[PDB]
């Protein structure tokens, strides 16, 4: 795939492409790689669609149940439930996931779970097949505490590149903005992100 | 690794008549599961009233046809425009095929024309040049869906004279070129149905003492 | 016994009432990395033949010099090099086809799919395909590698059988060829938006269009796609 | 495939099947498994279809070439050793042939050499070769006198091939018969195994477990 | 090597005018060696017939098994089991062992006693039901039989006619097949009478 | 392998069974009765895998001596057969499969007929006039085809048996060190110990 | 195999071809690949013939029992989630590739399920060996908000593309139209483009042709 | 390795890291990956040190001899001699090379020869193991007709990144400036390029 | 493989050589002289690969009949040996290597002694009192160790030979269909055709 998540002043933003390929064929060119496990805790999926789907599905539950009994779940907790699945099942899974969410205390929080099953908290994180090409662009162009539209732009550019260079990435660019004021879904089309 | 061979499919059939011979093939040329052409002919007029077909891998058969068509040009120049005996081209093809014995032309290959006596003849080949003269042989993928049927409706096999208990074999008749054509284009319409590598078109070359004629019949395109 | 590296994807082509059309994008790709973005995979020979090439770009550039070289030779000692005894498609083909099969047979193939398209001395349309194995075939409609799968079915909906060719105007063929290139970019992952398209009419000659772009794409509907089943937001 | 040849008072009998298969599929039953090399010598196809036809056809040439150059007939011993030598020359290049070279000369008498891909050359009295080889051997071994009427010993070949065609899936079709005298060979027909089986079940009382 | 073809044999079934036919060869052999010429591949359970080709010890096992299963259907259900039903029992029953299959190629043929309708169907070793109006084939001559049937078949054959047709399809495939032959048997199934003729063919 | 033969005549069934036991390089025994008696009128010869061979035949021996003892009835050959078959068919999709081939021959005291059954390690079972496992069949089936009548006296059939063994000693590469011939008839199971020179 | 699904304004329509291939041979020239899960939830099967049937028969049975516990019409999104999780329990070893569509109390739905357990939601979808032929048609002719008759032409058009241009697909065109208001309509063989031209002969044998050895009558009921 | 070449107003600049690794071990941390085939025609080596060395060695000759007879060699020609070696010997070589040089007519010229043996003329080209990470940074930050020190900086940054992210890249950053006024060799040390 | 034996006594050398030729499944001949005469007083028995076997022995026969004819001198055993060896050692690093094992035995007319040489397909040559190739050695070397005296009459040595063959027929799995025993002494090369019952 080709996904990333960035934190800022007001919260966190998730971004992805939309291209799931089996082979050289684009089986679906409109994939929703931004998947929701709670009001304001979402994930970025990459790897086997069948594995990342099964896990998110199973986390959506653990957290629906955690809400029933114990209350609203820290963004940290969503990550722990993902790691626990990915690590304890490493031998049979191929999934790299980015968990991101907004609570009121910490605001922007982002956790990247590589293949191993390790977990790493970070200000921003990139992953997916086409990430390799923007480790350069991102480390140079990222800043802490950006403004909302500053961050949308940072993502639009980073992902504009990943898709240019990756054949396993493309489609539209989907974003999901997570702030106090709510959940806002974004979409940017090819006629737009290519001219950058 | 690099793999120098293919399958382009198609299916050929050659039948030796009494005063004639037919050599038929389908027009479909494929690679795996896709279609390459619906018309790209398989059966060729080589002059001196010899029609041949090198079926299996197109590049190897195309190349073998070229190479024999040329063996004829030179048997002319070399032996004062003499006619190439059907039986002699067969043998020359054995030497052509066996030349590349250890890297063969991957083709089951059939020629048809008239023997020095005027009677019809058909020859079949390995990819390495075993040859025998045949009454009717099919080569290609759908070979197995045609031969049993031909054995039954051409050589009247397993057929007996009614009410003779099972002691008198149904008497072998000989068939107008028009009848053989019936069986050919029913052998094929059949195969087309149960083989996915057969269809599109059916082309027959017909050799009489009068020369070579082309008849062409459409086939299911699925 | 080599293996491809820098590659270019589908080449597509169909014949029509007077001439023929051939097109192919401008991308050579290093594996999954869309590395080179200015590649031309249509090679004009004269103004009666265009040769389209998919496959290993290094072996393509070699095949290109083989034709630049073969045009230089033709002219030698030949006052009719720009007329009667000048280079014909049917020749350029039988040459490349001979080479490809020779090379496969030395187990060191040129890793390509080649589509030779053009018009002959006598007005005849000429369209034929030859690949790394030496295989040769000809249909009213030919495409190589990936186009063979999606591009053909669309073009054969214009020219299904031979009787359909005279009935096919030129603006119709071009419209159908440009469609297929758009569809190729929706669904082919090793594809570029930039392509080149050449028309070869028996009347207007060689019309070679560089630097085109797939236009009028439909992606509005993606906005309405969320989740992967259960999801609503 | 089933091929067999043997010596006796009246020369040599050669008998073969004619079935040729591409797996489970029977592609032809019109195969000349006996190779008319020249009118005084026979070879038996067994192993590789082409490899046999071809080098024995070639042998026929090298044999004529030898008769012109010495104005005298080539001996089975040397005819065979030319083929054995040519074939050993291509050892494990992937040649496949297992054949009996048969001849009757002034000086040697009825003489049979078994020659194969491996480079082997063996003079013998009885050789069967092919998938149904073991079946032929069974019938030959039990019913073989040396002084066999040329007519009884021609029937023996007719039948050692039958035993085999029956059991073996890969042998069958029709039987070709050859008789080799000092004066040359004489074809003895092509008797279709279909019809022949029934004819023998009646006259012999055999094949008793075949309901018909 | 391949299980689906050590032993050999073919089975074929067709429909006619208010009738059905099913037929097979009597051959059982380990690879090249023919062992028995009296090994029938067609079994019956009430008025429903089942031909099974492929691996002997599984053809035999499935007969032994469907006897059992259908015998209890008769006792528990108070009636003889129907062809349409039995078909669905062979499917589910084969697919029971999906990842360790019986290497067989079953053909069901018979006449629904309430509706008098002719019925044939065939399966792959894990139970896909190919129901077909025309004909069903199975065995080592899967191909040859398809070739004969596609030519020799017309629908609504009278029974005495459809015997000639089915016999000729079977016979002429098995003669172009190395692993089939050695005898043959052909059941012709009218609405209430059932005739079983054995055939004369080459024996090689 | 390893020679397992048998022919059913008019009044009995006859089983031949190679005497040799070979462990790779050396011949360990020159006198192996490759057969267990399953009951008064039912015999089973066998060959195949090393240990798998005996251990199976004895398991069957037990289970049939148990059905004999329990119903004080001598289980019929057809049944002993169709049981042995099932026991092999069961073990073919099992963890380690019995790799054993067998010939079962016995007298059906109720039909007063002799019966010979052939079963391979897969559970493939068919009834025959004559039979064999391993390669034994190729050299001998051509002779039986020819010389076999189903009305053959028990004597006429021993003769035809010696003729097969002779062919196997001639055209077969293995030194199997002879046979032991056993006969099953109305009077039960006796063994002819005068064979390699009758 | 070729199967597609197409969403329109007041429903959804799904279509399939009718050819089942074992290798290169065509075993059923007309098996319906259109499977029923619930009255108004149907799905198209491509992959292992047996598994699309078995796994349909199952989820459909469980889903039937569930519409009864809950006294509620069965929902597409249920059949999806139960299929998804079953196929995934089985590490892809179950070879089903489905287009699952239907109408429930929540509107029109169209989903595709791959064997390893992945699911895709969309407006047009295609799976199987002709997947690419069909998707090329769909990508050229689909606009937002089709009509019942437009959306049917389009899915049948897209199945044809498969039939012709793919050796894996062929014969007829099955359709099922699930309108939101109405009952579901299943039009078996909605198109029959592949009808076998009348043979050149008729091979009905003269009675008595076949040699019989023994004849007898078996008994049917006790 | 990790190498690139950029053209500008006054000429062309070649840049590279200095880290040849066999395995996880840095066998030499000061490698001169900028190799000279003529006064103002140099290459960037990447791939087998033994292969790129042998080739450049053999090209240095072809061109010394071309000079003897026929005169001064176009930058284009140097490239053709490289391609001819790399392509006609593809089966037995692992080398990816960038040829760059300055003549007076065209000024800045750059040719990249990927593994295949293909040849591609470009304004700038990156290659070597660690290139994957800067396809993003470069496409965004490159401009035509840059000034000398503008281009030095563009290279310093691009390569500062490649080395950060690549384990098969590092050492010092070497540059070589090719203009009318001559050949100028540059070096930038870790204490410098890391702090960017 | 394929029985190649030989024992050198007081006044001669004796070579045993299995009579059987086997082609996988069937025994093709029951009477194979596995030995070429290299010259009046020098014999070579041999076994090994299929065609490679004969073709070699004959090449050596030719080349020694040629040195004999040329110098009208009968080349001594030691020399015929050390030549055959070099011809094998040459072919071991060649393209297709002769895969042949041989026993050379002959009478040195100048030392009036008998000599037996053993050479394997690799060119490994050593002179022996007794020798064998293939597995033939395992069953028989234990007997020779025990019963061999180097002063043994030619008669005393034939006896000991029969004793080895008997052990090979007992504990060896192959039916080799007998031996042919040849003797080499001052009077040349003669063959005892009364052996499997002396």
Curated annotation (Swiss-Prot), chain C:
**Might you name a Gene Ontology BP term for this protein?**
proteasome-mediated ubiquitin-dependent protein catabolic process
Q: What is its main location?
A: cytoplasm
Q: Looking at the keywords, is Nucleus present?
A: yes
Q: Where in the cell is it found?
A: Cytoplasm; Nucleus
SUPFAM superfamilies the UniProt entry points to: N-terminal nucleophile aminohydrolases (Ntn hydrolases)
In terms of superkingdom, the source organism counts as Eukaryota
Give the record's keywords alphabetically. Cytoplasm, Nucleus, Proteasome
Cellular component, GO annotation: cytosol; nucleus; proteasome complex; proteasome core complex, beta-subunit complex; proteasome storage granule
What Pfam family does this protein match (any one)?
A: Proteasome
Q: Which InterPro entries match?
A: Ntn_hydrolases_N (IPR029055), Proteasome_beta4 (IPR016295), Proteasome_bsu_CS (IPR016050), Proteasome_sua/b (IPR001353), Proteasome_suB-type (IPR023333)
Quaternary organization: The 26S proteasome consists of a 20S proteasome core and two 19S regulatory subunits. The 20S proteasome core is composed of 28 subunits that are arranged in four stacked rings, resulting in a barrel-shaped structure. The two end rings are each formed by seven alpha subunits, and the two central rings are each formed by seven beta subunits. The catalytic chamber with the active sites is on the inside of the barrel. Interacts with CIC1.
Q: What does the miscellaneous comment read?
A: Present with 16900 molecules/cell in log phase SD medium.
Q: Which family does it belong to?
A: Belongs to the peptidase T1B family.
Task: Extract the PANTHER family matched here.
Answer: METALLOPROTEASE TLDD (PTHR32194), PROTEASOME SUBUNIT BETA (PTHR32194:SF6)
Q: What is this protein called?
A: Proteasome subunit beta type-7
Native species: Saccharomyces cerevisiae (strain ATCC 204508 / S288c)
UniProtKB/Swiss-Prot annotation, chain E:
Q: Which UniProt keywords apply?
A: Cytoplasm, Isopeptide bond, Nucleus, Phosphoprotein, Proteasome, Ubl conjugation
Q: Name one GO molecular function term.
A: endopeptidase activator activity
Localization in the cell? Cytoplasm; Nucleus
Question: What are the Phosphoserine sites (modified residues) in this protein?
Answer: 30
User: Which domain of life does the UniProt lineage start with?
Assistant: Eukaryota
List the CDD domains hit by this protein, alphabetically. proteasome_beta_type_3 (cd03759)
The record's listing under InterPro entries reads: Ntn_hydrolases_N, Proteasome_beta_3, Proteasome_bsu_CS, Proteasome_sua/b, Proteasome_suB-type
One Pfam family name is Proteasome
Give the position(s) of the covalent cross-link described as Glycyl lysine isopeptide (Lys-Gly) (interchain with G-Cter in ubiquitin).
69
Swiss-Prot/TrEMBL GO biological process terms:
proteasomal ubiquitin-independent protein catabolic process; proteasome-mediated ubiquitin-dependent protein catabolic process
Pull one GO CC term from this UniProt entry. Answer: nucleus
Main location group: cytoplasm
Function noted in UniProt? Non-catalytic component of the proteasome which degrades poly-ubiquitinated proteins in the cytoplasm and in the nucleus. It is essential for the regulated turnover of proteins and for the removal of misfolded proteins. The proteasome is a multicatalytic proteinase complex that is characterized by its ability to cleave peptides with Arg, Phe, Tyr, Leu, and Glu adjacent to the leaving group at neutral or slightly basic pH. It has an ATP-dependent proteolytic activity. This subunit may participate in the trypsin-like activity of the enzyme complex.
Q: Which family does it belong to?
A: Belongs to the peptidase T1B family.
List the PANTHER family: METALLOPROTEASE TLDD (PTHR32194), PROTEASOME SUBUNIT BETA TYPE-3 (PTHR32194:SF10)
Quote the protein name from its UniProt record: Proteasome subunit beta type-3
Q: Which organism is it from?
A: Saccharomyces cerevisiae (strain ATCC 204508 / S288c) (Baker's yeast)
UniProtKB/Swiss-Prot annotation, chains F, I:
For the modification N-acetylmethionine, the affected residues are: 1
Keyword check for Transmembrane helix: no
Q: Which cysteine pairs are joined by S-S bonds? A: none
Gene Ontology terms for molecular function: endopeptidase activator activity
Q: Which InterPro entries match?
A: Ntn_hydrolases_N, Proteasome_beta2, Proteasome_bsu_CS, Proteasome_sua/b, Proteasome_suB-type
Reproduce the miscellaneous comment text: Present with 21800 molecules/cell in log phase SD medium.
| Subcellular locations according to the entry | Cytoplasm; Nucleus
Q: Does the keyword Phosphoprotein apply?
A: yes
The terms describing its cellular component in GO are: cytosol; endoplasmic reticulum membrane; nucleus; proteasome complex; proteasome core complex, beta-subunit complex
Keywords recorded for this protein, A-Z? Acetylation, Cytoplasm, Nucleus, Phosphoprotein, Proteasome
Post-translational modification Phosphoserine, affected residues: 76
Report which gene this protein is encoded by: PRE1
Principal subcellular localisation of the protein? cytoplasm
Pfam families from the xrefs?
Answer: Proteasome (PF00227)
GO terms in the biological process aspect are: proteasomal ubiquitin-independent protein catabolic process; proteasome-mediated ubiquitin-dependent protein catabolic process
Q: Can you say what this protein is called?
A: Proteasome subunit beta type-4
Taxonomy, superkingdom:
Eukaryota
| Assembly | The 26S proteasome consists of a 20S proteasome core and two 19S regulatory subunits. The 20S proteasome core is composed of 28 subunits that are arranged in four stacked rings, resulting in a barrel-shaped structure. The two end rings are each formed by seven alpha subunits, and the two central rings are each formed by seven beta subunits. The catalytic chamber with the active sites is on the inside of the barrel.
Q: Which family does it belong to?
A: Belongs to the peptidase T1B family.
Q: Cite the PROSITE patterns for this sequence.
A: PROTEASOME_BETA_1 (PS00854), PROTEASOME_BETA_2 (PS51476)
From Swiss-Prot, chain G:
Catalysed transformations (reactions): Cleavage of peptide bonds with very broad specificity
Gene Ontology molecular function terms on file: endopeptidase activity; threonine-type endopeptidase activity
Please tell me what else the database record remarks about this protein: The side chain of Thr-1 acts as a nucleophile, and the N-terminal amino group acts as a proton acceptor. Present with 11400 molecules/cell in log phase SD medium.
Q: Which Pfam families match?
A: Pr_beta_C, Proteasome
Instruction: Fetch the PROSITE patterns from UniProt.
Output: PROTEASOME_BETA_1 (PS00854), PROTEASOME_BETA_2 (PS51476)
Give the UniProt subcellular location, in the record's own words.
Cytoplasm; Nucleus
Q: Which organism is it from?
A: Saccharomyces cerevisiae (strain ATCC 204508 / S288c)
Q: Which InterPro entries match?
A: Ntn_hydrolases_N (IPR029055), Pept_T1A_subB (IPR000243), Proteasome_bsu_C (IPR024689), Proteasome_bsu_CS (IPR016050), Proteasome_sua/b (IPR001353), Proteasome_suB-type (IPR023333)
Q: Read off the lineage from the record.
A: Eukaryota, Fungi, Dikarya, Ascomycota, Saccharomycotina
In short, the EC number is 3.4.25.1
Q: Which Gene3D superfamilies match?
A: Glutamine Phosphoribosylpyrophosphate, subunit 1, domain 1
* Similarity comment: Belongs to the peptidase T1B family.
GO cellular component annotations of the record: cytosol; nucleus; proteasome complex; proteasome core complex, beta-subunit complex; proteasome storage granule
What name appears for this protein in its UniProt entry?
A: Proteasome subunit beta type-2
Annotated GO biological process: proteasomal ubiquitin-independent protein catabolic process; proteasome-mediated ubiquitin-dependent protein catabolic process
Originating gene: PUP1
Active-site residue numbers: 1 (nucleophile)
Q: Which UniProt keywords apply?
A: Cytoplasm, Hydrolase, Nucleus, Protease, Proteasome, Threonine protease, Zymogen
């Amino acid at each position: 795939a080709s996904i990333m998540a960035v934190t800022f002043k007001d919260g966190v933003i998730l971004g992805a492409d939309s291209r799931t390929t089996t082979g050289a064929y684009i089986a679906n060119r409109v994939t929703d790689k931004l998947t929701r496990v709670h009001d304001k805790i979402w994930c970025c999926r990459s790897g086997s669609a069948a594995d990342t789907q099964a896990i998110a599905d199973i986390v959506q539950y653990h957290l629906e149940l955690y809400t029933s009994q114990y209350g609203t779940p820290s963004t940290e907790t969503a990550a722990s439930v993902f790691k626990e699945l990915c690590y304890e099942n490493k031998d049979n899974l191929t999934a790299g996931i980015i968990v991101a969410g907004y609570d009121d205390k910490n605001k922007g929080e982002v956790y990247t779970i590589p293949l191993g099953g390790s977990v790493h908290k970070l200000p921003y994180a990139i992953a997916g097949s086409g990430s390799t090409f923007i480790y350069g662009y991102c480390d140079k162009n990222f800043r802490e505490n950006m403004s909302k539209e500053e961050t949308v732009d940072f993502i639009k550019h980073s992902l504009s590149q990943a898709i240019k260079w990756d054949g396993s990435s493309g489609g539209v660019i989907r974003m999901v903005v997570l702030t106090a004021a709510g959940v806002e879904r974004l979409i940017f089309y090819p006629d737009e992100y290519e001219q950058l | 690794q690099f793999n120098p061979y293919g399958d382009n499919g198609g299916t050929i059939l050659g039948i030796a008549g009494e005063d004639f011979a037919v050599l038929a093939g389908d027009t479909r040329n494929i690679t795996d599961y896709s279609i390459n052409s619906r018309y790209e002919p398989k059966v060729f007029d080589c002059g001196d009233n010899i029609v041949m077909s090198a079926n299996g891998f197109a590049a190897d058969g195309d190349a073998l046809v070229k190479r024999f068509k040329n063996s004829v040009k030179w048997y002319h120049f070399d032996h004062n425009d003499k006619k190439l005996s059907i039986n002699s081209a067969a043998r020359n093809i054995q030497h052509l095929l066996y030349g590349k014995r250890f890297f063969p032309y991957y083709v089951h290959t059939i020629i048809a024309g008239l023997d020095e006596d005027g009677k019809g003849a058909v020859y079949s080949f390995d990819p390495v040049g075993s040859y025998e003269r045949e009454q009717c042989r099919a080569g290609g993928a759908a070979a197995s869906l045609i031969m049993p049927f031909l054995d039954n409706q051409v050589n009247f096999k397993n057929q007996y004279e009614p009410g003779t208990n099972g002691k008198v074999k149904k008497p072998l008749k000989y068939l107008s070129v028009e009848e053989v054509i019936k069986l050919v284009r029913d052998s094929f319409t059949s195969a087309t149905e149960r083989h996915i590598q057969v269809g599109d078109g059916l082309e027959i070359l017909i050799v009489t003492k009068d020369g070579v004629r082309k008849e062409f019949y459409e086939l299911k395109r699925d | 016994t080599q293996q491809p590296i820098v590659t270019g994807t589908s080449v597509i082509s169909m014949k029509y009432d007077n001439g023929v059309i051939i097109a192919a994008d401008n991308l050579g790709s290093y594996g999954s990395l869309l590395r080179f973005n200015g590649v031309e995979r249509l090679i004009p020979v004269g103004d009666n033949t265009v040769v389209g090439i998919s496959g290993d770009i290094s072996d393509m550039q070699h095949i290109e010099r083989l034709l630049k070289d073969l045009v230089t030779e033709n002219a030698y000692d030949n006052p009719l090099a720009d007329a009667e005894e000048a280079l014909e498609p049917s020749y350029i083909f039988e040459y490349l086809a001979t080479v490809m099969y020779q090379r496969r047979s030395k187990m060191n193939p040129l890793w390509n799919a080649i589509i030779v398209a053009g018009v002959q001395s006598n007005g005849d349309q000429f369209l034929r395909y030859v690949n790394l194995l030496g295989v040769t075939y000809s249909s009213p409609t030919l495409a190589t590698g990936f186009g063979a799968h999606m591009a053909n079915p669309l073009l054969r909906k214009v020219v299904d059988r031979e009787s359909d060719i005279p009935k096919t105007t030129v603006q119709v063929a071009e419209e159908a060829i440009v469609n297929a290139m758009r569809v190729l970019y929706y669904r082919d992952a090793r594809s570029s938006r930039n392509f080149s398209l050449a028309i070869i009419d028996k009347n207007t000659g060689l019309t070679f269009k560089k630097n085109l772009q797939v236009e009028n794409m439909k992606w509005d509907f993606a906005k309405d796609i969320k989740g992967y089943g259960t999801q609503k937001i | 495939t089933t091929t067999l040849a043997f010596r006796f008072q009246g020369g040599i009998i050669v008998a073969v099947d004619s079935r040729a298969t591409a797996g489970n599929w029977v592609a032809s039953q019109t195969v000349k498994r006996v190779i008319e090399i020249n009118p005084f010598l026979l070879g038996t196809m067994a192993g590789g279809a082409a490899d046999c036809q071809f080098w024995e056809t070639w042998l026929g040439s090298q044999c004529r070439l030898h008769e012109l150059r010495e104005k005298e007939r080539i001996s089975v011993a040397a005819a065979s050793k030319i083929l054995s030598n040519l074939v050993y020359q291509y050892k494990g290049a992937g040649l496949s042939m297992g054949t009996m070279i048969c001849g009757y000369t002034r000086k040697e008498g009825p003489t049979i050499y078994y020659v194969d891909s491996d480079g082997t050359r063996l003079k013998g009295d009885i050789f069967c070769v092919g998938s149904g080889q073991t079946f032929a051997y069974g019938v030959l071994d039990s019913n073989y006198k040396w002084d066999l009427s040329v007519e009884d010993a021609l029937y023996l070949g007719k039948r050692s091939i039958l035993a085999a065609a029956h059991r073996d899936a890969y042998s069958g079709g029709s039987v070709n018969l050859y008789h080799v005298t000092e004066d040359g060979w004489i074809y003895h027909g092509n008797h279709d195994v279909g019809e022949l089986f029934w004819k023998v079940k009646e006259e012999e009382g055999s094949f008793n477990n075949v309901i018909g | 090597s391949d299980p689906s073809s050590i032993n050999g044999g073919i089975v074929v079934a067709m429909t006619g005018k208010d009738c059905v036919a099913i037929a097979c060869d009597l051959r059982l052999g380990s690879q090249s060696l023919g062992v028995s010429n009296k090994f029938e591949k067609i079994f019956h359970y009430g008025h429903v017939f089942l031909g099974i080709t492929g691996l002997a010890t599984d053809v035999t096992t499935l007969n032994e098994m469907f006897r059992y299963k259908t015998n209890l259907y008769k006792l528990k259900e108070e009636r003889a089991i129907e062809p349409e039903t039995f078909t669905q029992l062979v499917s589910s029953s084969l697919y029971e062992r999906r990842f360790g299959p019986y290497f067989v190629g079953p053909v069901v043929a018979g006449i629904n006693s309430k509706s008098g309708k002719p019925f044939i169907a065939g399966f792959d070793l894990i139970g896909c039901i190919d129901e077909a109006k025309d004909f069903i084939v199975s065995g080592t001559a899967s191909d040859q039989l398809f070739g004969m049937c596609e030519s020799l078949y017309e629908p609504n054959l009278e029974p005495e006619d459809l015997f000639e047709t089915i016999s000729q399809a079977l016979l002429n495939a098995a003669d172009r097949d190395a692993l089939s032959g050695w005898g043959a048997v052909v059941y012709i199934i009218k609405k209430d009478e059932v005739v079983k003729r054995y055939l004369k063919m080459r024996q090689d | 392998m390893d020679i397992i033969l048998g022919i059913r005549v008019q009044d009995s069934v006859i089983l031949a069974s190679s005497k040799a036991v070979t462990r790779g390089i050396s011949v360990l025994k020159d006198s192996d009765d490759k057969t267990r008696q399953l009951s008064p009128h039912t015999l089973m010869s066998f060959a195949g895998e090393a240990g798998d061979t005996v251990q199976f035949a004895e398991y069957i021996q037990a289970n049939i001596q148990l059905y004999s003892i329990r119903e004080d009835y001598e289980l019929s050959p057809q049944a002993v057969s169709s049981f042995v078959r099932q026991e092999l068919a069961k073990s073919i999709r099992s963890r380690r499969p019995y790799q054993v081939n067998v010939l079962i021959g016995g007298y059906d005291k109720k039909k007063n007929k002799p019966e010979l059954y052939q079963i391979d390690y897969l559970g493939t079972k068919v009834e025959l006039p004559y039979g064999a496992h391993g390669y034994s069949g190729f050299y001998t089936f051509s002779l039986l085809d020819h010389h076999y009548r189903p009305d053959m006296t028990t004597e006429e059939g021993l003769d035809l048996l010696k003729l097969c063994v002779q062919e196997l000693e001639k055209r077969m590469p293995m030194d199997f060190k002879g046979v032991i011939v056993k006969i099953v008839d109305k009077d039960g199971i006796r063994q002819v110990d005068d064979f390699q020179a009758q | 195999t070729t199967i597609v699904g197409v969403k329109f304004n007041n429903g959804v329509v799904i279509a399939a071809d009718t050819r089942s291939t074992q290798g290169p041979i065509v075993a059923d020239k007309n098996c319906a690949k259109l499977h029923r899960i619930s009255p108004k939830i149907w799905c198209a099967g491509a992959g292992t013939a047996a598994d699309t049937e078995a796994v349909t028969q199952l989820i459909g049975s469980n889903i039937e029992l569930h519409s009864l516990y809950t006294s509620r019409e069965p929902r597409v999104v249920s059949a999806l989630q139960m299929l998804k999780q079953h196929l995934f329990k089985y590490q892809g070893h179950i070879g089903a590739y489905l287009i699952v569509a239907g109408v429930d109390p929540t509107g029109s739905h169209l989903f595709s399920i791959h064997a390893h357990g992945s699911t895709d939601v969309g407006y047009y979808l295609s799976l199987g060996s002709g997947s690419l032929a069909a998707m090329a048609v769909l990508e050229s002719h689909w606009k937002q908000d089709l009509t019942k008759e437009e959306a049917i032409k389009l899915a049948s058009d897209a199945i044809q593309a498969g039939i012709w241009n793919d050796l894996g697909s062929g014969s007829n065109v099955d359709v099922c139209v699930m309108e939101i208001g109405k009952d579901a309509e299943y039009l078996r063989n909605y198109l029959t483009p592949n009808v076998r031209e009348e043979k050149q002969k008729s091979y009905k044998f003269p009675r008595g042709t076949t040699a019989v050895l023994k004849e007898s009558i078996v008994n049917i009921c006790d």
